[PDB]
Amino acid sequence: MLYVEILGNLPEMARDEVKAMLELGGGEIIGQDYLFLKVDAGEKAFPFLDRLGLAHEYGLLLVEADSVEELLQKAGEVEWPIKGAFKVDTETMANCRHDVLDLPRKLGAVIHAQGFRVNLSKPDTVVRVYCGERLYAGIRLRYFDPKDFEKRKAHHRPFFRPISLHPRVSRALVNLTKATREILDPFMGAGGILIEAGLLGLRVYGVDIRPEMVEGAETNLKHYGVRDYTLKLGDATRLEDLFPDKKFEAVATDPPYRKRDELYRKALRSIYNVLEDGGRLAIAFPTDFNGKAEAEAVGFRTLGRYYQRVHKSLERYFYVFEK
């Protein structure tokens, strides 16, 4: 069994991101306790879980219990796969129903008895306990450092434009398409979404109507070590003209905020036409555009819609559509 802890800011989007990666990884979510996800999946899912943008960490789930007593009892029957020295780190979620003070000491005693040593300052293995409705214990396999994403914000790129989504959200949009080979962004701008896609090891395609953006996105893509890119100056409403005999696995994009609605409608039509059957489109639109209705008109099925306020006079939805 595995566990994933998701971020709470966009929690439905985050859970759906995990679902998407687990589908690629042959698993599924079995339970949810506040922002802790109980996951039925194996090592096959690891390379996909490694892609996540809206998760704090994931790991092995070794014990679940309904009391500290039961947690410690069951932990004794587990053969803990500890590497090097360890420590126990408890996560008290907002709905924690259990007295977990000194739990790191107690559980560490149980694990210490199996032949392993505690190092509080520098652990090699971090044993985790989550406390919500129930208690869960296991081993952390990957921590997603917020710092890594903050360092990729727009102002840290060689080509600076203050237009991007948060890198975590850009990454989540790519993942929600379940792309495993490639992705196209037809409104690439400074390249925020294509940067995440490229860091995930995908082949990327980008379009922008502005030569400076086409140049600028390339500078940023090179900066982050993305090499398999194809960037074109052009019209996102004419993708079939742009990429004649190409059907794309997936599309992810943050369009600019022609009349606006006209651009959006024509872009949806054009994206639909160049998408593979079964292909997905992850896309943001301001809330006053009827994105669901307009995408469904061109043939899309709606898989997700997630609300977000941008600032005091702008709200948007993130969408996931399927062809």
TrEMBL record:
The cysteines covalently paired via disulfide bonds are C96-C131
Which compartment or compartments is the protein found in? Cytoplasm
Gene3D superfamilies xrefs: Vaccinia Virus protein VP39
Ranges of residues in domain THUMP: 42-143
Reaction equation(s) it catalyzes: guanosine(10) in tRNA + 2 S-adenosyl-L-methionine = N(2)-dimethylguanosine(10) in tRNA + 2 S-adenosyl-L-homocysteine + 2 H(+)
Residues annotated as binding S-adenosyl-L-methionine are I193, D208, D235, A236
Q: Per the record, what is one GO cellular component? A: cytoplasm
What main location does UniProt list?
Answer: cytoplasm
Q: What is its EC number?
A: 2.1.1.213
Per UniProt, what is one GO molecular function of this protein? Answer: tRNA (guanine(10)-N2)-dimethyltransferase activity
- Keyword line: Cytoplasm, Methyltransferase, RNA-binding, S-adenosyl-L-methionine, Transferase, tRNA processing, tRNA-binding
Q: Does the keyword Cell wall biogenesis/degradation apply?
A: no
GO terms (BP aspect): tRNA methylation
A Pfam family annotated for this UniProt entry: UPF0020
Instruction: Write out the function statement from the record.
Output: Catalyzes the adenosylmethionine-dependent methylation of the exocyclic amino group (N(2)) of guanosine at position 10 of various tRNAs. Acts via a two-step process that leads to the formation of either N(2)-monomethyl (m(2)G) or N(2)-dimethylguanosine (m(2)(2)G).
Oligomeric and partner information = Monomer.
Q: Tell me the protein's name.
A: tRNA (guanine(10)-N(2))-dimethyltransferase
**Native species of this protein?**
Thermococcus kodakarensis (strain ATCC BAA-918 / JCM 12380 / KOD1)
